[model samples]
Target chain A: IVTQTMKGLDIQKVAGTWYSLAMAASDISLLDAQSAPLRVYVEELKPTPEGDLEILLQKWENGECAQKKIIAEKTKIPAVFKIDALNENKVLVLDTDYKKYLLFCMENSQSLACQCLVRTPEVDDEALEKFDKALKALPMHIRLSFNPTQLEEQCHI
Target chain B: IVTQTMKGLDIQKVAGTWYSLAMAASDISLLDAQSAPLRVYVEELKPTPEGDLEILLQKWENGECAQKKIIAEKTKIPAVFKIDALNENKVLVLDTDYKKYLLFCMENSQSLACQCLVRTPEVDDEALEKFDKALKALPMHIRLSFNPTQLEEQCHI
Candidate 1:
């Protein structure tokens, strides 16, 4: 598929820890589960002065943040992005309201994923209500293909 | 987390073959890898004259649709569902929009599962693109923790 980016993304507004909410669904028979919280703490989104988006994205696992410490860059498009990623450490800002953001990434090709990010990590019903609507209202293909949360659990945010 | 139902879901739009995606992610240091695809396929959603949604679900393995069919009923909420399912023959339309959907079920407790399903058993770029975005926009917990598709391979479909 062709890569598309948001038209007018306000980076400053979107510059913070946008916790990972859920991911695109894949065939359960295809892959097994991995232990990790679905979160993305965005450390920065700078003009870079010269380099990439200068984004510091980290993950949580085994009860701690596993700092891969990767810096991402802005693509030719507005909200589209890339990192020193090849093992599939890439990202894209599909949609965002600054308050709640939609993101896509490739932990690896087989691990293509997307998620909702909010200004805060705490589970805000208000935030989730909006996010859920946005998700339910996604394009038809997405509405049917993206894997969603199935846990009777909440975020340890 | 408590299971919530969607307010006004259209079952006709949802009645069709929905494919299984992946399972939820958890530490499961104790549960190792339970051999199960955290997914479910809704074979059909029969519309009873009562105009309520009646459902049929199944599993897949060895290239044949696994024959653990279960009929589901609506809870107090609309379109939301439940079943006498266990060891994988269980399901919940955590969310759906007909063409694509967010499904929840269990193959293993360690395998808290969810999936993306579509009417057709084929891949479409537009569908994939939207699904990818929805995935990218899931809650951080789902994005990171809900053990997603640890796929072994692809289905011929």
Candidate 2:
């Protein structure tokens, strides 16, 4: 129920490098170890002059990492952004402290997915507890961490 | 000119294992060596009971191969199919003998991509020539091959 209400993000503070700590999705295939569509590392978040959010993400490709930018269009609810693509998926900011960790959920008609991203490579017990609490409250199933070295390399700024 | 006009396909005959030989796209990133959105191997094509086509594709994930199926919804033109995704992209069969090799193109409003597939691991001069001709007739640029070992390993089925 907590994730149901929008807690607007301080766009400026949220803009920075964040590595994916863990992921959960309704379908296991969506979080496949190698090429799951959800296997994305948040490289940077840029708040646009237009009030939209620009997300630069690194993904595994051809055995290497590559970057791409996706725009999360602003909405009436600043905490909620819509990514218009095959279907318009809503990205809701569930919780964040601007430094320690960020927890969010992505949803469309068919499925729900959540990610636990942290400023540091190692998610402390404090952050892990918070993420676990949020995961249980959300609709997502199957939760797992990314490859250790994958996160290590990604965290190397 | 040939890719622009759909010669239509025999869906039943098109159903089988095919390996990606070469690819060309309007944007270089779509054909990225590692994780390009177009970096998909045609694993199997199955005609659905409802007359649609189910495409089973293998893609690089993490550092290994994984399989996923996408349905190519039927259109009035049997040779053309619309894959409902982030955007509805059209898949057109340009040339194929249903044996040695197959040539097809995928297009949306913003981009065009083509792929050459073959039943054999090694694409002889015949198949290569047909593919090159089709590539020249299309709008795509920056042609490249998927990893040599990647394709060889994938063809082991």
Candidate 3:
């Protein structure tokens, strides 16, 4: 079964600004090209009856604010997050709403990001399976790059 | 006292596409207001002898490809990143080459995609200190708004 942990983190860590990397429903890369900034602020922190923390994120984009709430529980592992669903490692889940789930992975900082929205529980299973298949299909070497000087010169100038 | 680690990550995890969150130089968000599809592709990955990995990323905006290399290393503790000189973390540092550093962070999966250029480091200790102070003074509750639906609707209409 999936278990939650008891470690308390400073809610302020979530209050700082954050940028969006990728959206689950789209293939847009919002990096140096045509991306804008997104600042996130912590509006409220509420404790749930289940002894977990629910955080309300007031996201600022294009001069307006939108609210997104995320609940975090303590895990046995320091930085690993398991959704409240089937409790399997194959499918990681997070609840934006009681029924709405997003599959995600955490970075080394014990922070969760890179979330993909799931339409249904079955869809989550299918997505995970497809991800596994894709992993197996990758070739040995991989290369990625970005030109910062061009980005700065273009955007700033 | 900071150390750096650049290791070959699971290419599959780094594959597909990623969006930008925050960079080191600017306060302007990169992808927050964009409704059009913007993305980058991992065209290639090469390993370096220093245990760092080099990646080539292809921007879809104008069919341009840029090359960047990073070294990911473990900190004294397992997931923490220490950013001192002589550390692999320094490989990704923006103080020396702010533009390249910002662009690198934007394309990488591990970096945040916000305006980091606003906090560029200077050679003088006093200047660096002042910039640090300014960063701390920035308010956390800032936000912006974006209407993806409006853009999509407009595109169709």
**Model 2, span B1-157: residue lDDT tens:** 3345446467788778888876667654565345557767787788886778899988766766777889999889878889979788999888889888888888886777788888867645577567667765454433554434446775222
Give me the TM-scores for chain A across all models, comma-separated. Answer: 0.57, 0.85, 0.28
Docking class of 3: incorrect
Q: Poorest 10 consecutive residues of model 2 chain B by lDDT? A: B139-148
**Residues B53-123 of candidate 1: C-alpha lDDT, one tens digit per residue:** 56565555665656454555555555445555554233345556566554443323233344455555444
* CAPRI quality band, candidate 2: incorrect
Model 3 chain A scores worst on lDDT over the 10 consecutive residues at: A137-146
lDDT of 3 by residue, A1-157 (tens): 2232224433233332222211221122222223222123333445455444565644544445456676666455433433343332221232222232323333221222233233232223344333323322221111111122322222211
Q: What is the lDDT of residue A85 in candidate 2?
A: 80
Q: Ignoring the other chain, what TM-score does chain B have in each prediction? A: 0.52, 0.85, 0.26
Ranking, lDDT, top scorer first: 2, 1, 3
Error of 1 at A141 (Å): 11
Q: What's the true lDDT of residue A28 in model 1?
A: 25
The DockQ of predicted model 3 stands at 0.02
DockQ-based ranking: 1, 3, 2
Query: What is the TM-score of each predicted model, taking all chains together?
Result: 0.44, 0.47, 0.24
Best by lDDT: 2
